[model samples]
Target: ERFHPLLGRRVLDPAPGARCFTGTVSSDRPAYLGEHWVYDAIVVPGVTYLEMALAAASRLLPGNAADTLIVEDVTVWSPLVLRAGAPARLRLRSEDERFEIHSAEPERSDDESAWTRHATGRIARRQLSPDATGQLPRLDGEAVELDAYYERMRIYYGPRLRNIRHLERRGREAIGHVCLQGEEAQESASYELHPALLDACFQCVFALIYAHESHREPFVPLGCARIELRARGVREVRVHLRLHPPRSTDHNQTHTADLRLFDMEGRLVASVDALQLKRASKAALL
Candidate 1:
């Protein structure tokens, strides 16, 4: 409970250029983490990667008061699945301008084969002005009922983690409203940006994909071009999404979402620009 649950217990053993922040991630701690079920696995959510990076980054920055946390060009190489009764030993290697989040089984220590890199990106800090273009999306269909949507959604999430409460789809665009549940809201202060709330913003991309493709498998976040986070402790946000086909160079993957989160009043809270996603089979999630 040292400020943030996803962060390491201590920033320890600083080498010449690399520093390690180590901790354990289990089902019990940060109880909400246990609820992020990707298929049958309690996989670590993408938002936690951003949190870990920010935690390691804050130590070297000027101070929190002077700037906002922005993680640019984030790539989540693979999923980190957590097993009950077995917590993964986690590490965030802060080397100069970038950071990487990795985990290993408690018994293996730091052997090359033992550790796996889950996420990596560069950290940026600065004042960010709102980038609203007055072009919010308006859908023709009625909002989809939450229960109906989840039943068809490939990834099954518990109530606490179902941050997208409202979803409406039209053609290639989608608009969603995401907010933390009541009890989760009670614990909001402990996080820079609650992973549940932020994850919901990312999850909206699925809405953009479902109509365009024939696959029923889930699409997990592969990378994001830029994520500008200027607000914290936000209980709710509106999402604006635009999905497009993959670039000519990349053929295996499908759909890229340019998503932006805004307050109810329409002020920009956070933005996930060019989020890259790929279909994940149930077996691949493990």
Candidate 2:
């Protein structure tokens, strides 16, 4: 309920050809509180800003309204790649909100140095994970360690986005992987879009990319993501994952992956576009 503060707000529902609210980082908010980071982002109106942005974008991309949108995957680039602090823009394909969001602006600005610009969000929250309250799928004993998944999942919700939580070796198969975490606080004693939680989903995407060994060339996460909070009680959340190569129409089997998140209730929550690039032994997060 409170998490959806921007749900019915007029600031989020603007007419076309107008700029959404430009949220700013605050100096009063503490940097880290409890296990949550960005607790003091000074001005963390990201969710509310997004709510309005999507409400407006949806008018343009109507299909995004009902689509089982999930933040499939997220790709974080440095100034070397995505400049920094550019006006994170959102554009759509036809009427469908399924669109393309450039990580940064065309020309990098000093403000657009650190990773900025989020993919357009307009998807369900449950689609990202299997453990949406009562919906977490029964983990297979032979499958990857669910606890390990939980551990990394927690790491994904940690205080920093660049950090990675290590998983107990699942034999020689699963190793040297990472998750990208992100989040924002909702109210006292709770949080929204926990950064690490998103990281955990991104981590899952990272793991999926590293899985089965073909880490030669990584996939570039290029696409818009649609995410919306379904219900309240979202003190925290996590995103599950799925990976598949491009089809015939998909030139060169570029080896891409999609990340999904769900609440324990088995509802589709979020989806992302996976864009991963493999490199030599630079395993710092692992």
Candidate 3:
């Protein structure tokens, strides 16, 4: 498998200014099935538009050191859905310190005709530094064991991809360990933080909210995220999270979380500031 495994089996074009790659998502692929669930006969997690952009951006900048490419201000116009075995394409345009990624699906009527665009985003390269030593929130709660952590998460995420292997929690603070398994671990050995690892860190946030607030409905979907990468080569990460209480106003309950990832030796790997998660209906998810 290529270092950037998500781009699929073929490169459509690699011309100087315009480059394209194509791949299909199957129900069995780890990236699709393991990390997501089934909802309305469709994937629950939705295809990771950020990872799609990361994979394409990596292809454009070959031979760059790991953790050098930083993505910021990315907005997903809509969810990217992959039915049983739908073909997806990524087209890239490169510029100084910036790269644009456009995602589309093949036209059903005409194979050679235009593809429909579903999601688009941009990424840029920047210098990253380790997490500042004194910036971590104080850990105050009881430490959650690895087995107990997985058992707590089984209802929302299946057994195949529960990345937060170990955890401990206080009222608003959480500390945990997330490990890369299978091929994900192999591909991410050189990255400061791969998408899967980043995804796992967020999963810890989900667990943190649920652990502290199990009385309320536990179904929450990520409304938006603006994660900043500050280091690389983190195969196994210790996650620290601070969950803010939801402000009561209307039926829609919204909460914000602040998170930081550190390596085994306790160096800061990345930071997530004010990531939002909103309560979602079962019908919406299913």
Candidate 4:
């Protein structure tokens, strides 16, 4: 657990540098098999927690960085492909100066300009939960006051529901998806983390597999490499996705989804490289 890669590194200002964040929300009724927020199961499926952790990690950076830095311009240094049940670690860190960033891990890179590896950790597979349908209610087709959405949600669902993080979460009254001006304006949200919200902002140069998801289930994540994150000040986003896995030829339910997240400018945010595992027996949840 100490040396797994994918933990990014950056020099955190004692008061305003980079840091890590972890958050959770409780549910009144059990929708996932675990009778808890699917996000928290010790053993679960998919990448919701990883996505959430990545989002929190990005937001941990200064909001100013998010504004000036184009995610496409960022250098991401993680393996593009991940195998199910393969053990892995992640690292994230920040440098006080841009030129100081190290691109490769100690054993991997001796390049002069590489971003230094910072945090070290890994993703593990325990028994897991699939997606929780209807967990996050959808937004109606209407243009409502963005700040009002935050206020109402804060009051109704409490602070955890607020999307803001780090300095971005401070006093900012509203949070809205970022989407293009001419495209479909309305969006449907997944119950998990948004990949565009991550992209370059989330770092993990060194990754070591700790455990792998069950290979007995034939699924692989073959996307997310070099995907761009939306700009910091971006507002409003959407996705038009289609999932066509090889298993579909057999009409098997093992294949899940292929999703795309984008900003209002139609800039790609993140894409799911998810591979669906065979559906577990009802008894698996126990």
lDDT of each: 0.73, 0.34, 0.57, 0.28
Q: In model 3, which runs have C-alpha deviations exceeding 4 angstroms? A: 1-3, 8-21, 31-35, 38-47, 57-67, 84-119, 128-138, 144-156, 190-192, 212-225, 249-252, 281-286
Tens-place lDDT digits, model 2, residues 195-234? 3344444455545444344333333233333344433223
TM-score of each: 0.85, 0.42, 0.72, 0.31
lDDT of 1 at 191: 71
Model 3 residue 125 CA deviation (Å) reads 1.7
Best by lDDT: 1
lDDT of 4 by residue, 135-162 (tens): 2223333232335434432312233223
Candidate 2: residue 215 lDDT (0-100): 32
> Between the candidate structures 3 and 4, which one is better when assessed by TM-score?
3
Model 4 CA deviation exceeding 4 Å by range = 1-25, 28-47, 59-64, 67-228, 232-236, 248-250, 256-258, 274-278
Candidate 2: where is the Cα deviation over 4 Å? 1-16, 26-134, 141-192, 211-220, 224-229, 237-239, 245-255, 265-267, 271-286
Q: Please give, for residues 1-286, the per-residue lDDT of candidate 1 as tens digits.
A: 3545677566655377876678887976777777776667788877788767765555555655535777887898678888865788878877778888888998886575789988989887886554554445566665656665566663557767777878887765778998887777887766767788877877677654554454356677887888777666678888888777556432345568888777787777777788887877777665
lDDT at 242, model 4: 32
CA lDDT of 53 in candidate 4? Answer: 34
* Prediction 2 TM-score vs. true: 0.42
TM-score-best of 1 and 4: 1
- After the best TM-score superposition of candidate 3, give how far the Cα of residue 200 lies from its true spot, in angstroms: 2.1
